[PDB]
Amino acid sequence: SMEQVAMELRLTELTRLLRSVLDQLQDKDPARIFAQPVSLKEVPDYLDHIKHPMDFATMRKRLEAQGYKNLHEFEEDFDLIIDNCMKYNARDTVFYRAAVRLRDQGGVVLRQARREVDSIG
């Protein structure tokens, strides 16, 4: 149907916007601390600590399958990246501090992305 196509056009446009949001968020992580999943080879106990791991590569795979239906879904996954890091790592670590910085700097980007998603519908 044409209604289905129009919905698919909306999803594709959302996907494009979210790809530019994701690139902008990831620039706020120049050390690439959050680029890839935590390795179970190198932190074998990770899943006893963190129940829903997340990272920018995993987000990017979901995005390219148009797997985010709305910005809320995407924000949830971004928030997991930050929140997981701040639970697993102590305050005095380079990891925790990189999460704080990503949160603070990403908040700016997300604030206007919310306006763009509402605005363009």
Side-chain angles (χ1 to χ4, degrees), residues 2 4-6 8 11-15 17-40 42-60 62-68 70:
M2 198 53 225
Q4 287 296 324
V5 166
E8 296 168 352
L11 180 54
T12 298
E13 285 315 296
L14 176 66
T15 302
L17 184 155
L18 293 181
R19 185 176 311 128
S20 161
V21 175
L22 178 63
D23 294 345
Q24 279 173 81
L25 293 174
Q26 188 151 23
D27 292 336
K28 308 309 180 161
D29 173 30
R32 298 186 75 81
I33 292 163
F34 311 108
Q36 297 294 329
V38 172
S39 180
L40 303 169
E42 298 158 0
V43 191
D45 82 342
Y46 191 65
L47 303 184
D48 296 334
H49 296 263
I50 298 295
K51 296 314 189 182
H52 299 97
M54 195 43 61
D55 68 270
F56 287 129
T58 300
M59 294 194 58
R60 198 175 295 285
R62 183 166 165 188
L63 190 58
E64 293 312 311
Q66 298 189 345
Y68 299 111
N70 58 53

Side-chain angles (χ1 to χ4, degrees), residues 14 17-18 20-22 24-25 68 70-76 78-79 106-110 112-119 121:
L14 176 66
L17 184 155
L18 293 181
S20 161
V21 175
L22 178 63
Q24 279 173 81
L25 293 174
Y68 299 111
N70 58 53
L71 178 63
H72 185 76
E73 286 189 353
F74 176 102
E75 293 171 305
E76 285 194 327
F78 178 65
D79 284 338
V108 178
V109 172
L110 287 172
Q112 193 59 37
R114 160 51 62 204
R115 299 189 62 87
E116 292 167 313
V117 168
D118 283 1
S119 187

Side-chain angles (χ1 to χ4, degrees), residues 60 62-68 70-110:
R60 198 175 295 285
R62 183 166 165 188
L63 190 58
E64 293 312 311
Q66 298 189 345
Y68 299 111
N70 58 53
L71 178 63
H72 185 76
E73 286 189 353
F74 176 102
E75 293 171 305
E76 285 194 327
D77 273 355
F78 178 65
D79 284 338
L80 275 177
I81 292 178
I82 294 307
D83 290 340
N84 285 350
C85 181
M86 299 167 76
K87 289 170 186 91
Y88 189 82
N89 303 105
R91 213 135 57 233
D92 73 331
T93 60
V94 65
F95 308 103
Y96 183 113
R97 288 164 178 280
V100 167
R101 290 164 63 88
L102 179 58
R103 192 191 59 181
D104 285 349
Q105 299 204 294
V108 178
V109 172
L110 287 172

